[PDB]
């Protein structure tokens, strides 16, 4: 009924410690408290039973060791290794592989986490409002140019479309048939997406018959068009993306931010 | 079980017959607890739609699901800890929010069933039949009862009628729908609704979705449509062996008004709604939720606003209490129609011997 | 902020209301026995205007007469009414230019375009505007917005678009598209210049239109400078914003209250329906602003005026209105309709979301399923119309008629179908 | 169209067994169509139907 997956990879995005021969992405003590410790704590809070961590080509035993020693654990944590890995997909290829072991619902959570917010309320939201998928966006760094933008809805709370600024046409575009049903659409500037995914019961059919998603974003939330043509088959409750806003200063990892995180922690 | 008590709000000097508060937000849940029940509790905590009849059905469904999930263990027998589990569940339900007579009856029936089937029988064979029997029971003591009610209404109700109702009496709604679409007759249906619950509004919406002409009403006046109103059905929850009714909100007021002006009121119910317990006032057993339904300034339910309201303890002594279930009278609801077709509420327990 | 002067636009878009307008104009026609400019006048009075500018052009004489009749020509009020002359079927640029040439205003002036019915307080808004002005020199105009009627599924013609701000409240862009009949465009481009100066952005699509602007002493100068502008919403404000004058900003304010401008027929119908319901509180028929009308609220959702004669055995519905001196024999199955003052009726009116204007003589029998009857357009015997049917001026309807959806009836006693004199689509006589 | 008897003759005998599909109850018993011997209605009175909630 309740199981979770922990994504782990290799330090490709980070620039100035990560390129060492024996040090992994999961075990990085950059800012006092360990990186995967937080994740473990979160898991514990969430009351999830059989949680399995997915491992890449690099580091096979180190993660196991981390899981076992150092720390209270008690619960049966197991480290499984899929084979089809390229990194040219971060975890999509792993997700595709692990699907018959999912009995009910699963949550996607990376190895790197910075958390301060209450985390039960996300789960509760996912449960209650008849939501298929729910993601999170958090405020810009408060402590003392070209930016990234995403779609929001605030009074029900809903998500629509996702585009960054790396590879796109210079001017913005809004579809017509994806407006006559669900009218009001809002775009915010300050918000930063943490890349946390929640999945319901019927999602396993997509990642075995016809995959298209890259970096776990393309063919997951954006194909919710119930107008115009009707060509791509919808899987049944209609396809609906969701988003929520939170106050506390803690966010994602994609660019150079470790140094800022370090500055932040001592408060 | 987990964690109990630790909650705000005073005991209240006026009206304290039953305990007032609970488990809403989940933390450190036990391994053996089925999540469906938890989900149901979460729903009920802030529910709009269900009332009396569908709740019981939902409970039954949940029980069936649980049964389906469970198999006879190696060490412990089939009748070893099942009863204990049931008791625990009941306790949890009580903790969440007080329950109905129908639910109790269902529980009793379940217990009887458990008593009936001997543990020496083949296990697979047992629940195969047990589940079927449960299904049959569900069909009979609910859907068939509803059908019977409908048929009673059919013979009695005149050639096209103006109908007035209150609450979320699902059976009555169904009947109305049938009248509108299946048998096809004129339906000038009037629905009344209060502040704390938006049940009436929901009913109206549903009717609109089916294509029905509805008249929406509130507390401030009722008589404005009366002084014209010809035939009325009341909101139902539970019946007593007095001849009285334990129902929702200002239904009693409506009944009184009806008594005063022209014509009495009538209520149709299920044959397994009746109790053998008795009471005669709105002080006996009060059904309570948190005083928060009128804190938000009207309109919709989830809003979150900045204003003035929110003084439960902030200012120099203030209490904002309410009631959900009240006492409906006897001399006015002359009609009672069940699985036994015809009779009066003056015959308060004529069917209790027959069952 | 004492002593004010404003310019109001009336008879803005004729031919948009295609069935009507030939001798009697557009704005002169009532909503439900009461004209639409009256509300505007009331609003102006509430505001505190001392000098009123008003434009007349098409069928102007009658409008002028009506204005004269209404009790504002006398010096009891702080304001006087003056007429601005303009050629047949005109825009707003030319008129603005004319006004500029004439040259009177010193300080603040308000331009209201279209047909606006309001139930809102504006003193606070004015105060806010003043405050904004005090804040910084380079500041232009104020605008109003409101949340739309739930879901736009029946309202098909106009879907608005606004890109606003939280702190200072500012917008540049606006867009409209059709779609439900035949789809076309699926892309809209947005300004990428300077954004991070204010940081916060709130985009809202479906909102109720009115077109109101509280303007400072900049607009006429701007007009004088650049003579290429035609309309204010599409060209002017946007132009001003787009690197024309450095540092110039606008202000915005939101109100949830009912305020709708009229443009089409279905919209008009919806407005009428809203009025029939108790949606408006400063504007209801029982209060009576004119002090000559005697309408009062009644049971089973009906509006009525004194003395209405009707024969025995009746059947009445909801959200209706019946005028004074409406002499009815047998019949009436009234469901969701407006009927004007004094209507002689022979027998029976099957009413299913219908409409009737000022002074209509109806003969024998009519099965009506959502249709409108205009002023002095008398109905003969046997009237049968489907949904959305609209009749014009002086239509002397005789024996036997059948029409369907989207059909339009003329007013001329010029080009359009369904003729006035001697029947409609059963005989050809007239111009 | 669905008709025709299952056996050789139209009308049943004495002591023979038949299966019935019920349509409506109360007032008489069950004047109902047969699935063993023709589609024409056959009736039971409210006495031979039950032995040991019956109307439910």
Curated annotation (Swiss-Prot), chain A:
The modification Phosphothreonine is found at residue 225. It comes from the Eukaryota. Coiled coil: none annotated. The modification Phosphoserine is found at residues 215, 219. It is found in: Cytoplasm, Cytosol. Belongs to the eIF-2B gamma/epsilon subunits family. Acts as a component of the translation initiation factor 2B (eIF2B) complex, which catalyzes the exchange of GDP for GTP on the eukaryotic initiation factor 2 (eIF2) complex gamma subunit. Its guanine nucleotide exchange factor activity is repressed when bound to eIF2 complex phosphorylated on the alpha subunit, thereby limiting the amount of methionyl-initiator methionine tRNA available to the ribosome and consequently global translation is repressed. Component of the translation initiation factor 2B (eIF2B) complex which is a heterodecamer of two sets of five different subunits: alpha, beta, gamma, delta and epsilon. Subunits alpha, beta and delta comprise a regulatory subcomplex and subunits epsilon and gamma comprise a catalytic subcomplex. Within the complex, the hexameric regulatory complex resides at the center, with the two heterodimeric catalytic subcomplexes bound on opposite sides. Present with 9530 molecules/cell in log phase SD medium. This is Translation initiation factor eIF2B subunit gamma. It comes from Saccharomyces cerevisiae (strain ATCC 204508 / S288c). The gene is GCD1. The chain holds residues 2 to 413 of 578 of the full protein.
From Swiss-Prot, chain B:
Keywords: Acetylation, Cytoplasm, Initiation factor, Phosphoprotein, Protein biosynthesis, Repressor, Translation regulation. Residues 342-352 have a biased composition (Basic and acidic residues). It is found in: Cytoplasm, Cytosol. It comes from the Eukaryota. GO terms for biological process: cytoplasmic translational initiation; regulation of translational initiation. One of its GO terms (cellular component) is guanyl-nucleotide exchange factor complex. Residues 328-355 are annotated as: Disordered. Belongs to the eIF-2B alpha/beta/delta subunits family. Component of the translation initiation factor 2B (eIF2B) complex which is a heterodecamer of two sets of five different subunits: alpha, beta, gamma, delta and epsilon. Subunits alpha, beta and delta comprise a regulatory subcomplex and subunits epsilon and gamma comprise a catalytic subcomplex. Within the complex, the hexameric regulatory complex resides at the center, with the two heterodimeric catalytic subcomplexes bound on opposite sides. Present with 10300 molecules/cell in log phase SD medium. This is Translation initiation factor eIF2B subunit delta. It comes from Saccharomyces cerevisiae (strain ATCC 204508 / S288c) (Baker's yeast). The chain holds residues 237 to 593 of 651 of the full protein.
UniProtKB/Swiss-Prot annotation, chain C:
It comes from the Eukaryota. Its main location: cytoplasm. GO terms for molecular function: guanyl-nucleotide exchange factor activity; translation initiation factor activity; translation initiation factor binding. Keywords: Cytoplasm, Initiation factor, Phosphoprotein, Protein biosynthesis, Translation regulation. It is found in: Cytoplasm, Cytosol. Signal peptide: none annotated. GO terms for cellular component: cytoplasm; cytosol; eukaryotic translation initiation factor 2B complex; guanyl-nucleotide exchange factor complex. Transmembrane segments: none annotated. One of its GO terms (biological process) is regulation of translational initiation. Present with 33800 molecules/cell in log phase SD medium. Component of the translation initiation factor 2B (eIF2B) complex which is a heterodecamer of two sets of five different subunits: alpha, beta, gamma, delta and epsilon. Subunits alpha, beta and delta comprise a regulatory subcomplex and subunits epsilon and gamma comprise a catalytic subcomplex. Within the complex, the hexameric regulatory complex resides at the center, with the two heterodimeric catalytic subcomplexes bound on opposite sides. Belongs to the eIF-2B gamma/epsilon subunits family. This is Translation initiation factor eIF2B subunit epsilon. The chain holds residues 24 to 472 of 712 of the full protein.
Swiss-Prot record, chain D:
It comes from the Eukaryota. Phosphorylated; phosphorylation on Ser-50 by the GCN2 protein kinase occurs in response to low amino acid, carbon, or purine availability. Phosphorylation inhibits the guanine nucleotide exchange factor activity of the eIF2B complex. The modification Phosphoserine is found at residue 50. Belongs to the eIF-2-alpha family. eIF-2 functions in the early steps of protein synthesis by forming a ternary complex with GTP and initiator tRNA. This complex binds to a 40S ribosomal subunit, followed by mRNA binding to form a 43S pre-initiation complex. Junction of the 60S ribosomal subunit to form the 80S initiation complex is preceded by hydrolysis of the GTP bound to eIF-2 and release of an eIF-2-GDP binary complex. In order for eIF-2 to recycle and catalyze another round of initiation, the GDP bound to eIF-2 must exchange with GTP by way of a reaction catalyzed by eIF2B. Present with 17100 molecules/cell in log phase SD medium. Eukaryotic translation initiation factor 2 eIF2 is a heterotrimeric complex composed of an alpha, a beta and a gamma subunit. The factors eIF-1, eIF-2, eIF-3, TIF5/eIF-5 and methionyl-tRNAi form a multifactor complex (MFC) that may bind to the 40S ribosome. Interacts with CDC123; the interaction is direct. Interacts with GCD1. The gene is SUI2.
